[PDB]
C-alpha cells in the first residue's frame, strides 16, 4: 500500500520500480511473510528432530527403568511397589458408574434433538401441525398377554412424559447437561474454549463451587471443604490421563517414554540407574544415527532359546545327587483336574448373583435394564429387593381394606 514512498527507499534499482506498481509491492510483502513462515518451519523441524540423537538408555533395564520381582511371579512381598488404585476388582463398576455419570454431563452426542426439544418446549407457539396419524387403540385390560402389556405400556406415554417433565424439567434448565449452545464443531477451537471457561462450565454441577458458595455452617464444615476435596481428585485424574497418553504416544513410535512413574505391585526399581531410564548426553548415540537400534529377530530367538534350556553336564553317576535342584526334596517327592480341571478363583463375588439369575427366569427379558454391579447394593439384587418389598407393601395395603 505505497509504503515504499516516504523518504528513505531511494538508491535501490528494484524498490523504485516497486514504487511504480502496487501489485509488485503487495506480492513482495506476501513473499516476505511466507519466507518467514518457511524459516520457522525449518528451525522447529530441526529442533524437534535433533534431540533424538543424544538420547541414551540404561542398558540393564533397556530403558524400562524397572525390573521384576520374581517373588510374586509364581502379607505378601514387601520389596515390590504399592498396589495401584484399580487392583481392587470389587470396586470396578462403582468407579465406572461415577465416571460415566460425570461423562454424561459433557456429552453432546444427542445435541440436536435436545436442542430442538428445548426449542419446542421453549415457545410452544409455533404449532405448525401437519396431519395427525390414524390412531390405534390398545386391547383393553383383563387380557393378560405380553403383547397386550407392551401395547398398554406403549399407550401410557404422554401423561407420564408430562409427569416426569414436572418432576425433572428440561435438562438445559437444570444445567445437568452442558448449556444450550456453548459449543458447536464449526467455529474455532479458539472461540469454543473461551465459551467453555466463562463460568465453571468445565465442571459438572456436583463439583461446581457456585452451587455451594451460599451455605457453609457450624454443623459439618464439609459443604465447602468436601467438595473442594473432590475437585482436587478430579483434576488429578485428568492430569494422569494426559500423562499416560503422552507416554502411549511416545511408545507408539520407539521413543523413550517421558514420564518415569514409580514401580508397582510386581516390580522393583532398577538399581543401576536410579529408576531414571534414559537421558541426554552430548555424545551422539551412534546406534540411533546409523539405524542399528533394534536387534534382528533371529538373534533374540537364539538368546531366549539358549536361556530357557539350561544344561546338566554333570551326571548323578559320580556326583551323589539324584534329586533335582531346590530345597525340601525329600518332602518334595512324597480331584477332577484331569477333566474339567481347575476352578477359577477370581470371580466368587458373582456366584450369588448367578444363582438369582437362575431362580427368576423372567429377569432375562429385554424390557428390563438393570444398572449393574455385583453386591447386594448393586444391580440385580436392587431390582429383586424393590419388587419383593413393594409387592409385600401393597399386599399389606390390601389388608387394610
Amino acid at each position: 500500500m505505497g509504503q515504499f514512498y516516504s523518504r528513505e527507499f531511494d538508491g535501490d534499482p528494484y524498490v523504485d520500480l516497486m514504487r511504480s506498481l502496487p501489485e509488485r509491492e503487495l506480492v513482495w510483502w506476501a513473499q516476505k511473510v511466507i519466507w518467514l513462515a518457511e524459516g520457522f518451519t525449518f528451525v522447529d523441524h530441526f529442533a524437534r528432530t535433533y534431540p533424538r540423537l543424544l538420547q541414551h538408555k540404561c542398558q540393564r533395564c533397556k530403558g524400562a527403568g524397572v525390573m521384576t520381582c520374581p517373588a510374586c511371579l509364581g502379607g505378601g512381598c514387601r520389596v515390590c511397589g504399592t498396589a495401584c488404585a484399580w487392583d481392587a476388582e470389587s470396586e470396578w463398576m462403582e468407579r465406572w458408574g461415577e465416571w460415566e455419570s460425570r461423562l454424561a454431563y459433557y456429552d453432546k452426542a444427542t445435541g440436536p434433538l435436545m436442542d430442538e426439544w428445548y426449542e419446542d418446549v421453549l415457545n410452544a407457539g409455533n404449532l405448525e401441525e401437519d396431519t395427525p396419524p390414524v390412531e390405534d387403540d390398545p386391547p383393553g385390560p383383563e387380557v393378560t398377554g405380553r403383547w397386550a402389556e407392551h401395547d398398554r405400556a406403549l399407550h401410557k406415554d404422554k401423561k407420564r412424559m408430562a409427569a416426569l417433565m414436572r418432576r425433572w424439567g428440561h435438562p438445559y434448565d437444570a444445567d445437568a447437561n452442558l448449556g444450550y449452545q456453548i459449543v458447536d464443531p464449526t467455529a474455532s477451537m479458539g472461540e469454543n474454549v473461551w465459551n467453555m471457561a466463562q463460568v465453571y462450565n468445565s465442571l459438572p454441577p456436583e463439583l461446581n463451587p457456585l452451587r455451594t458458595q451460599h451455605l457453609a455452617d457450624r454443623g459439618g464444615g464439609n459443604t465447602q471443604a468436601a467438595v473442594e476435596a473432590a475437585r482436587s481428585a478430579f483434576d488429578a485424574q485428568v492430569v494422569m490421563e494426559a500423562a499416560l497418553l503422552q507416554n502411549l504416544e511416545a511408545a507408539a513410535q520407539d521413543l523413550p517414554k517421558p514420564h518415569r512413574l514409580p514401580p508397582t505391585a510386581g516390580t522393583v526399581a532398577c538399581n543401576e540407574c536410579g529408576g531414571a531410564a534414559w537421558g541426554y548426553s552430548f555424545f551422539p548415540n551412534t546406534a540411533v544415527m546409523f539405524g542399528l537400534e533394534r536387534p534382528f529377530w533371529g538373534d533374540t530367538l537364539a538368546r531366549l532359546s539358549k536361556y530357557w534350556n539350561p544344561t546338566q553336564v554333570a551326571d548323578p553317576a559320580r556326583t551323589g545327587q539324584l534329586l533335582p535342584y531346590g530345597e525340601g526334596g525329600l518332602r518334595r517327592l512324597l480331584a477332577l483336574e484331569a477333566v474339567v480341571g481347575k476352578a477359577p478363583a477370581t470371580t466368587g463375588r458373582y456366584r450369588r448373583d448367578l444363582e438369582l439369575l437362575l431362580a427368576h427366569p423372567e429377569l432375562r427379558d429385554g424390557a428390563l435394564r438393570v444398572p449393574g454391579g455385583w453386591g447386594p447394593e448393586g444391580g440385580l439384587q436392587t431390582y429383586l429387593r424393590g419388587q419383593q418389598e413393594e409387592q409385600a407393601r401393597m399386599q399389606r395395603r390390601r389388608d387394610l381394606a
Binding site: 462403582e94 458408574g97 461415577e98 460415566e100 455419570s101 454424561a104 454431563y105 444427542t110 434433538l113 426439544w117 419446542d120 405448525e128 401441525e129 401437519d130 396431519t131 395427525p132 396419524p133 390414524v134 390405534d136 386391547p139 398377554g145 403383547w147 397386550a148 407392551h150 401395547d151 405400556a153 406403549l154 406415554d157 404422554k158 407420564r160 412424559m161 416426569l164 425433572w168 435438562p171 445437568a176 447437561n177 456436583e206 437362575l358 427366569p361 432375562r364 427379558d365 429385554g366 424390557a367 428390563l368 435394564r369 438393570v370 444398572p371 454391579g373 447394593e377 448393586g378 436392587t382 431390582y383 424393590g386 418389598e389 413393594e390
Partner: protein
C-alpha cells in the same frame, strides 16, 4: 425407597417398539431347530391389530406419496414428534445422570 433400580416399564428393547409401532410385515412361519428348552437353555433339538396398522400405513404413505399434504415432499419429517421416542431418550439421560448416588 425411590432410588436407582430400573424397571420393565421403560421399553429398553428396540425390536419391541419396532414390531409394535413400525414393523407390520408378517412372515411365513415354519419349523425351528434352535429353541429354549427346559432349564431355560437355548439348545438344538394379536395379528389383526397389526394388520389394521399395516393397512393404515399403506393408506397414509399412499396419500403422502402423490403430493397430497399440508407440506410438500414424499420424504420429510413433519415435526409431529412421536413423544414415545422423545420419552425413552429422556429416561436414558436421566438414569445416566442419576447414577451419581449409587455409592
Amino acid at each position: 425407597l425411590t432410588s436407582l433400580r430400573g424397571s420393565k416399564q421403560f421399553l429398553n428393547s428396540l425390536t419391541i417398539l419396532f414390531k409394535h409401532q413400525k414393523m407390520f410385515k408378517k412372515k411365513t412361519l415354519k419349523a425351528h431347530k434352535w429353541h429354549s428348552d427346559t432349564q431355560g437353555i437355548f439348545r438344538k433339538h394379536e395379528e389383526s391389530s397389526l394388520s389394521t396398522r399395516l393397512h393404515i400405513q399403506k393408506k397414509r404413505k399412499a396419500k403422502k406419496q402423490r403430493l397430497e399434504t399440508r407440506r410438500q415432499k414424499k420424504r420429510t419429517r413433519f415435526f409431529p414428534r412421536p413423544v414415545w421416542l422423545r420419552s425413552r431418550m429422556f429416561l436414558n439421560f436421566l438414569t445416566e445422570r442419576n447414577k451419581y448416588y449409587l455409592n
